[model samples]
Target: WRQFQLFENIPIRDPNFGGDSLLYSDPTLCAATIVDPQTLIIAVNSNIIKVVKLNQSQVIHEFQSFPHDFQITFLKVINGEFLVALAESIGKPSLIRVYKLEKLPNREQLYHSQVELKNGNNTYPISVVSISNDLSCIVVGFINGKIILIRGDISRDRGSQQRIIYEDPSKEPITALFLNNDATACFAATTSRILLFNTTGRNRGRPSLVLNSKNGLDLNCGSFNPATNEFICCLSNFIEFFSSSGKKHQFAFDLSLRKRIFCVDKDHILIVTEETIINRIFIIDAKNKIISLNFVVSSAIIDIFSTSQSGKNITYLLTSEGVMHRITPK
Candidate 1:
């Protein structure tokens, strides 16, 4: 992990700012979610959530709804709001709560919605959430292998209300979800399997197919590429590419990236380990072989995303300590 952090211009050995303490103490970053353009990085420490600004190396906001009782498991940016999920205190009731945030004068205004749960006695920590483009609905997943499609429309007089439209109890906890270009179908992945659902309406029609992974296939992260009409899944040692039409291709690499992988773009992927080593960012090609991006950083990167302006694209990363970095590939 340390070797990967020492790039020519990007050295991960010593960050210029000491913002990690503001983000987390978990040697490995958790709940590291990225929202581009806005330069927002969300990280979890203990039972609290910290929102940091990438360019300024500062923590702009902090939220700990359950007060030393819950840890954030996932976070997503929808439209102009952030959707968060939390796991309850140890040995206590586990409920999924959703909060809406809007930029206000000098600060952020947070609006808390009632918690959502499937069972009172069961722990259902939400692992993922994908909101519709219009913000009319939301799709959520839980640790107990439950998936739910909820409706959330704020244009109505009552602001936002929710109703679960679908549930699947046999599948593993969903870790990622991406809606198709047409909003007619969605691709979701769990620990060892990937499933596609037609989310045209209230009922998420049965999955078109389920892709089961072999021993080497531990699905961690995934994304849909509209340019190639392909869906890519990051496994333990390689990336598996599947076309919308059902074709498949596997690109393997020689290096051992023994941890979770998050993608920043078509050319780069970020890796985070379980140890204290610095985070590594690697560039790869269609063949899946590592390409020399010549970049390094001293902090363990927990999550990443891409921001584009005109035709120029840049990569943004969040470290376990909550410091944010924005890099432009040269």
Candidate 2:
């Protein structure tokens, strides 16, 4: 048996569900994130992004919708006051849009609110985006093997630095991207290789291969741990960790070859596994090498966010079926 907090359905006002929805399926939803402890912002029904309050179980507001073919690929809540989103349509170039949250005395004023940053000229879908905790840097990885680093206040349009740090002529998606603690460096993972890029001063555009997955193996996912400033990448059958300066360590997790480093937390690790449950949650103790807490669940996870509310630490787990689970480690 497992314990979960508030496992209830979120009423998404999505127009497409059963027929002809572009990205809505059993294991995937457009995106979901926390705007506040009690409120959530989700991208569903392909092109709609809305805010829903948990207690009410209904959408309170729908963000300004995008163009016809545009569907949001990513949504990230920043510093509790602003958000950055990547919206892309099939054949068009992607857009990085920033939004400022405000209490409204006006209905439409919330969007005055938003400005779009130049995502780059590449038509490739962005594989990942990582914004440093300090807001000093932002990294965008393209499926066509290009990585762009945006330095400065991306939440605002003025005085932000944007540049293409590297591009792979072989052409493959940059599966993951992470910025170091100060945004001075980036760790990028691709289909089978990982590279480090310097994002500061004269070294702002240099690259070196950090590690490679040989012949039969491939690299799947990765993330930068802020507390340790070390990036963790999940390989074919192992979990690898590296510091921005050089390789720090490596460990093997053979639970499932197909899984994601869903999130790395202070004392535990949440991995999205593809066993009996797709994106099923696997909890690993940070101190131990194996999973310490494993739950048998049915729902496929859409996203997980660690948030702080009421001056206490809290976490939110969202599912593709629109269920929200609150985990409070009090």
Candidate 3:
């Protein structure tokens, strides 16, 4: 019997996109949000990058990557620096940019550099990106089924120091990329398959395990559960559980229309599904048992993030209307 109790609600002001009526009407078009624990810097999208301080609830900075309009597809914060991936259009090649926050005499400064892809191709856009916990490595997935690993200071480097770690022979667009708690392994999910790679030791390039869809179902998201040392992946209508050693478990739950999955803690997982004007949240336990909580919010959920603070775990839910809600397990 676990539930998410409302902790705090923070209102985010809508950005003025310079006469762009579509962007003004729908504030939920923004994506690729990353939170920095060290500086409390929150980078979220709205036709531009809005950097805010979570503690102060103020927008301290803003970044617009290109002269023309673009959307942030992925964002990650490591140490005191941040990485962003942007795409201009559907078939345009994605650009990865890195920036660091600097303190100066009068004001703070943001120094940035664009990391160019060594094997440059403009055919496919970047679908997903994930950074290692140590901030030493980054894994990027492209729509053409290529998975690349870029090592070193991505924000400051300009050489073709990237490697093609793995390629999806079937050429499926990758939907999700996630690193384990210890950063020793990474899990990549495509529309039809899930692959886990060992990031250390002699087995670095070898995939520890791989799972393919038998019924050809598309995967929506994937996450690593540290408590159980298991991997959870969301499909179109159900959620599948797998062991860390690449064994597929018999446990499968039918969650029709589940759009996203978030691992709150070792004990609980949150599932979001569309239902009319509002969205539904289901809290499930580790053993695949559904908790008795029927939580529903009044707006459409755009994204959800979880972090640890002062030995407690906190979850934030962002709505389409630019409202941020903080919740905690009870």
lDDT by residue for model 3 (67-148), tens: 3445565555554345454444444555666655452111212335555553345567776677765556777777777777
- Judge candidate 1 at residue 225 and give its lDDT: 64
Q: Model 2: per-residue lDDT, tens digit, 1-330?
A: 233332222323332435553222323458877777777777776656667665565566665556657778888887777666678875566666666656322232334233343444546777778876555577887777788777765545555766777776577778878777777777877675677888863554557545554511123357656667787766667766778777667666664545556454555556666764444556655565555445444665566676666665465666565455555443
RMSD of each candidate relative to the true structure:
5.5, 5.4, 5.1
CA lDDT scores, all candidates in order: 0.54, 0.62, 0.59
Runs in model 1 lying further than 4 Å from the true structure: 1-68, 80-115, 154-171, 201-206, 213-219, 236-238, 243-247, 254-258, 266-280, 287-300, 309-311, 322-325
Candidate 1: how many backbone clashes?
Answer: 6
How do all the candidates rank in terms of TM-score, highest first?
2, 3, 1
Model 3's lDDT to the true fold? 0.59
Q: Which regions of candidate 2 deviate over 4 angstroms?
A: 1-29, 103-122, 134-136, 201-220, 277-279, 310-313, 328-330
Between which residue pairs do clashes occur in model 1? 10-296, 11-297, 12-297, 12-298, 13-298, 20-321
**lDDT (Cα, tens digit) per residue for candidate 1, span 292-314:** 35344576555665666525566
Error of 3 at 155 (Å): 7.2
TM-score: the better of candidates 2 and 3: 2
User: TM-score for model 1?
Assistant: 0.68
- My TM-score estimates for the predictions, one after another, are 0.68, 0.79, 0.75
